[PDB]
Every structure is written in structure tokens, then in C-alpha cells.
Design a binder for this molecule. Structure first.
Ligand SMILES: NC[C@H]1O[C@H](O[C@H]2[C@H](O)[C@@H](O[C@H]3O[C@H](CO)[C@@H](O)[C@H](N)[C@H]3O)[C@H](N)C[C@@H]2N)[C@H](O)[C@@H](O)[C@@H]1O
Ligand SMILES: NC[C@H]1O[C@H](O[C@H]2[C@H](O)[C@@H](O[C@H]3O[C@H](CO)[C@@H](O)[C@H](N)[C@H]3O)[C@H](N)C[C@@H]2N)[C@H](O)[C@@H](O)[C@@H]1O
Lengths: 137, 136
């Protein structure tokens, strides 16, 4: 009802808590911060400019800028103008997907591919609508 | 196969985060709080906890959290322990009103069976997540 909204909130919070911990090392190894890690993953889908990363994130442009030219300085991200990723930035993503899919696999090894398929169809349809509403304001 | 489901879940979450971010700017601006401050009010909307555990859930490191707490204490949004105020209840309510109306108007053409099956699959995955997290 609005039980689903609370569940989702709690589900997303839980996924972030797990992700943080599993990614603590890789991040330390890269000089990277959590939020920077995110930008690097947020940027895993499309090249973005500071404002877009700020809008799609809620935080004050100031903070988003500090962590953005730290990634350029680290050659983890790059200009063109927009912001794409660099090999060291990619290698990070690979190492990230790897830690993620190894545990994701675990807790889902006894799942039924068909049931998961339909579930996703629904989520993809809600994702589509979420993005759509987000375009206006 | 799963590498894909991971990307989507992640995109799905990125989009949910984006969306709540836009739908709540005006409101946080209104109650004069930052987004991080908002999130802090939402965990305490559920239950109240001290600083020690408040950062353990988050992930944002050293004292950064206690700084949000005292920031929120100053607006009379959070009472000391540290829980939630009467002023805080209003925000969440207003927050929930927005989140729900939109979430409903976005799920309203689906078949109850359909949604439930989604919940049941996300619940089980959340059950394994925590259980894995717990095993520190
Ligand atoms: N605080 C808010 C302000 O931050 C930055 O100002 C400066 C940062 O503070 C510096 O980073 C410092 O603080 C970081 C943690 O935040 C540390 O990791 C780092 N070692 C420190 O050198 C960075 N090198 C230059 C940057 N111009 C942003 O530009 C500005 O938009 C924002 O308003
Ligand atoms: N409880 C489950 C919910 O968790 C967040 O709810 C809160 C957000 O997290 C806040 O986000 C900002 O404040 C966080 C504080 O820690 C920062 O970490 C984060 N990087 C910031 O952008 C936002 N401003 C308010 C929102 N009520 C998610 O957004 C939401 O999708 C999910 O349903």
C-alpha cells in the first residue's frame, strides 16, 4: 500500500549497507571514497556533467564538484565536453561487478529463472515510468 | 545472466534515488534541511538510535553523522539516545504523502498478484542480504 514504499526504502538502505562493506577495500585501494565510488558507478551507465550528477543525486553542487575533479586528478574519469570513464576507472567497475556478482550469485542459486523473469518485467516497466516522471520535475 | 540483473537492480535503485531526490527538494528546502539530513529523519521515522549505530548503517565515516544529528537537533527536528520530534513527524508525513501518491499512481494498473510476487522476491533477497551483512 505504502508498506511497499517502506519496504523499498528499507530494501534500498540494506543494499547500500551491504555494498559499502563489500566495497570497502577496493575503494581504499583506489584512494576512492564511497560517494566517489558511486559517481564512478553512476557514471557506469552514461557520461554526465556535474549538474546532472548533482540533480540525479540531491546533494549540493559544491560537494559534487569536490569529488569530481578528484576523479579527473586520479585519471579514473575524463573530460570528453562531458564525463566518461578511463581504463583505471573501468578496471574499478570490473573489480566492482566481480565482487557484486559473486555474492549476488550465491543468494540466488536456488531461484527459478522464469519467476525472476516476470518479476523483472514488472520492475523494468516501473523503471520506465520512474524515469519518465523524472524528466518533467 | 545475473550480471544483468545486478545492473538493472542498480539502475532501478539509481532511478528511485533520483526520483525521491527531485520530489523532495522543495520540501527539504522548505523545512530547511539538506538531503542527508532528510535521510537521517527517515530511519528515525521507523526507530530511534544513537550515533554509534547511525553511522554503521550509513557508511559515511568519522563524525560526519553526529554533525547531521546536531544540525537536526538545532531545528527542533530531533529530540535526544536521539529519536524524532513532533516537528519531525510532520515532515515524514508530508514526505510519505508525496512518495505514496506517486507510487500508487505508478502502480495502479498492475494486478495485485503481480506486485505481491515482486515484493515476495525482494523480501527474500533482503532476508539474505541482512543475513549476509550480519555475518559481518
Ligand atoms: N567542503 C566543501 C567544498 O569542497 C571542495 O573544496 C575543496 C575541497 O575541500 C578539497 O578537498 C578537501 O576536502 C576533502 C573532503 O571533503 C578531502 O578529501 C581533501 N583531502 C581536502 O583537500 C579539494 N582538494 C579542492 C576543493 N576545491 C569543493 O571544491 C567545493 O565546491 C565545496 O564547497
Ligand atoms: N530509507 C530508504 C530511502 O533511503 C533514502 O531516503 C532518503 C535519501 O537517502 C536521502 O538522500 C540523501 O541523504 C542521505 C543521508 O544519508 C545521503 O546518504 C544521500 N547520498 C543523499 O542524497 C534523501 N535526501 C531523503 C530521502 N528520504 C533514499 O533516497 C530513498 O530512495 C530510499 O527509499
Amino acid at each position: 500500500i505504502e508498506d511497499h514504499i517502506s519496504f523499498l526504502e528499507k530494501f534500498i538502505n540494506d543494499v547500500n549497507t551491504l555494498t559499502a562493506k563489500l566495497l570497502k577495500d577496493l575503494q581504499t585501494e583506489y584512494g576512492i571514497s564511497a560517494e566517489q565510488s558511486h559517481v564512478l558507478n553512476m557514471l557506469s551507465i552514461e557520461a554526465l556533467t556535474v549538474g546532472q550528477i548533482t540533480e540525479k543525486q540531491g546533494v549540493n553542487k559544491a560537494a559534487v564538484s569536490r569529488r569530481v575533479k578528484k576523479l579527473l586528478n586520479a585519471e579514473l574519469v575524463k573530460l570528453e565536453k562531458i564525463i566518461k570513464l578511463s581504463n583505471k576507472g573501468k578496471k574499478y567497475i570490473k573489480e566492482r561487478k566481480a565482487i557484486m556478482s559473486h555474492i549476488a550469485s550465491d543468494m540466488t542459486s536456488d531461484f527459478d529463472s522464469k519467476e525472476i523473469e516476470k518479476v523483472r518485467q514488472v520492475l523494468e516497466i516501473i523503471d520506465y515510468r520512474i524515469q519518465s516522471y523524472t524528466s518533467k520535475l
